């Protein structure tokens, strides 16, 4: 009531004094420090009357930048720092195809070689970290290693692998079952069936892993505070005192991950 | 420094230091148990409390209560 | 929204103000 109003007025006076002190301290600094501002980074951005068509189930990290004419299929994911600039031409990410951290997918100017085609990444493909894609046509069920660079004109066929740290030269086709790699990107060896199983399992594991990141990067301020309080409260445990009190403190469901992301599916 | 003041200070320092030295040696000469510390007032408290509780039941001379009737 | 709602927190603020004022008076009056 009256006490609450008085305390509110005192708080207003204290806030005013604090802001005045902040301004004075900024003046003494010589106005050399550039003040932090509200975030102006747009996750999804239009360029030329063109909008991305990100699907409902896609996980697009807040630090990612899906720009221009980008079409992303169900179940796929775009991870932190990844850039998909489709301003000049089209980029079509398939279903289940995840583009990993700091990866760049950019399409050519439709005339880099005269008969350029858009970047068509297929289904269930996985692209490694820091990879660079500049106009490829990666077919479905493929693997691009981390750090690999695919120049314009290349076509990674189905069930083919590009080794990490490779440079696929322009107009180079990787046949099915090969593991082409190296800076010249020459033939290395044939793929075993275990490698194919590994590719499929990695794609499915990343599909299952994108869900917890999506559920964590979209929480509101109120939910974040509650989860932080619960995490602090259950960080350390004391079974002796709980047994002495006859209680059993159990971790809340908000701090439990699905068993499909644990190393071996640990229920207990 | 003024030569007279320095010498005067030195002599005064020696003299006062010798007096303080004698005082501190006599201080160390003091025994741990003072001469008749049981004679002190702080160490004589039963002599002042027992007369006040002399008539309390449980401490009386047996013949005391036999004469308090009259 | 010019009202502080938490009654317990308001009493803590009042107690802190009283403690500061009393400490200042104690250091001044004696």
């Amino acid at each position: 009531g009256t006490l609450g109003r008085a305390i509110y007025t005192v708080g207003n006076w204290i806030r005013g004094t604090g802001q005045a002190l902040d301004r004075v301290g900024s003046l003494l600094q010589g106005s050399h420090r550039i003040e932090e501002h509200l975030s102006r980074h747009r996750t999804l951005m239009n360029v030329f009357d063109k909008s991305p068509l990100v699907d409902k189930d896609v996980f697009v990290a807040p630090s990612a930048s899906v720009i221009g004419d980008v079409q992303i299929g169900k179940g796929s994911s775009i991870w932190y720092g990844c850039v998909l600039r489709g301003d000049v031409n089209n980029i079509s990410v398939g279903s289940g195809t995840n583009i990993q951290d700091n990866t760049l997918v950019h399409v050519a100017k439709t005339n880099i070689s005269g008969k350029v085609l858009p970047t068509l990444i297929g289904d269930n493909v996985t692209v490694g970290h820091s990879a660079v894609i500049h106009g490829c046509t990666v077919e479905d069920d493929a693997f691009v290693g981390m750090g690999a660079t695919l120049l314009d004109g290349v076509v990674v066929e189905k069930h083919a692998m590009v080794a990490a740290g490779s440079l696929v030269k322009q107009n180079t086709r990787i046949p099915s079952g090969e593991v082409w790699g190296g800076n010249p990107a020459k033939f290395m060896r044939k793929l075993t069936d275990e490698e194919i199983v590994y590719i499929s399992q990695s794609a499915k594991n990343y599909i299952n892993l994108a869900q917890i990141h999506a559920s964590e990067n979209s929480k509101s301020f109120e939910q974040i505070e509650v989860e932080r309080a619960l995490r602090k409260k259950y960080a350390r445990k004391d079974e002796d005192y709980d047994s002495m009190l006859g209680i059993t403190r159990e971790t809340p469901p908000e701090l439990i991950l699905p068993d499909n992301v644990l190393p071996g599916g640990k229920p207990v | 420094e003024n030569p007279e003041e320095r010498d005067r200070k030195a002599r005064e320092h020696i003299y006062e230091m010798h007096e303080r030295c004698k005082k501190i040696k006599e201080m160390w000469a003091l025994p741990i148990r003072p001469y008749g510390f049981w004679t002190f007032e702080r160490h004589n408290a039963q002599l002042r409390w027992d007369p006040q509780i002399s008539q309390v039941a449980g401490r009386r001379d047996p013949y005391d209560d036999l004469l308090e009737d009259n | 929204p010019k009202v502080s709602e938490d009654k317990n927190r308001n009493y803590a603020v009042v107690a802190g103000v009283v403690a500061i004022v009393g400490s200042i008076g104690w250091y001044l009056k004696a």
Binding site: - | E1, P3, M17, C21, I24, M27 | -
Partner: protein, 262 residues
């Protein structure tokens, strides 16, 4: 008016200022340490100028109470014997700082801080006129030199040499401390001006002289205890050897000149 207080407080301020400076600012640390050492050296040179050379009384005397009954107190004074030792011990420190100029990026602030604490503790040794506190600052030099030998040694042998030096110094120190205690109990004070005017009995003179010799002969190696000096000298930084050879070997001679012989 230049007195013994400022000459001792200058290294104190120099070491305090470097104590709260970020280690990334390597240039500032070196500049401030060198400036403090040079200011202390100039202060000593000025102290030389105003030194009277016709009086045997101690000059620039300063006092600060230590025991509540003024039995023992911080008495600071210089004479014609310990003036040049103070000048030398303030002159050697800037040279020690300049020696490790190039490599100072690796040692850090703890190097110059250690040398400044060394200077502060060695200026007070040559200026103390109280027997007990002369021992307190006499054997306080171990910690800075222990750190200097161990932390910034050359090879893995640095652990052994530090142990040997520290152990010999302790063996001398406590056997001298017993004599200091016996003198304090009998005389009543530990002031040099009073201990030089007290007639000691003939029997007690030999025992006290031997006990004083035990601590001093280690720091001025005569014959049987000269086995720590070579190892400590070789297993020491270049500036560290200058301190051990320039000043720390002058404690025994000064101790004999100031206390034992009178």
């Amino acid at each position: 008016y230049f007195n013994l207080s400022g000459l001792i407080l200058c290294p104190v301020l120099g070491s305090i200022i470097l104590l709260f400076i970020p280690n990334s600012r390597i240039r500032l640390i070196r500049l401030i340490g060198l400036c403090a050492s040079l200011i202390t050296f100039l202060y000593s040179l000025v102290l030389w100028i105003q030194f009277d050379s016709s009086t045997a009384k101690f000059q620039f005397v300063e006092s600060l109470r230590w025991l509540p009954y003024e039995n023992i107190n911080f008495y600071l004074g210089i004479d014609g014997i310990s003036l040049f030792f103070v000048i030398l011990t303030t002159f050697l420190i800037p040279i020690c700082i300049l020696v490790g100029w190039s490599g100072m990026r690796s040692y850090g602030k703890e190097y110059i801080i250690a040398f400044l604490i060394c200077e502060f503790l060695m200026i007070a040794v040559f200026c103390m006129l109280d027997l007990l506190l002369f021992y307190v600052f006499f054997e306080s030099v171990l910690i800075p030199m222990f750190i200097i030998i161990g932390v910034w040694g050359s090879r893995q042998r640095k652990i052994k040499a530090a142990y040997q030096f520290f152990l010999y110094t302790l063996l001398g120190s406590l056997f001298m401390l017993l004599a200091i205690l016996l003198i304090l109990f009998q005389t009543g004070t530990t002031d040099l001006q009073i201990l030089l005017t007290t007639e000691f009995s003939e029997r007690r003179q030999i025992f006290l002289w031997i006990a004083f010799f035990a601590s001093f002969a280690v720091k001025v190696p005569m014959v049987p205890v000269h086995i720590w000096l070579p190892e400590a000298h070789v297993e020491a930084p270049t500036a560290g050897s200058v301190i051990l050879a320039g000043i720390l070997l002058k404690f025994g001679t000064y101790g004999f000149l100031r206390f034992s012989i009178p």
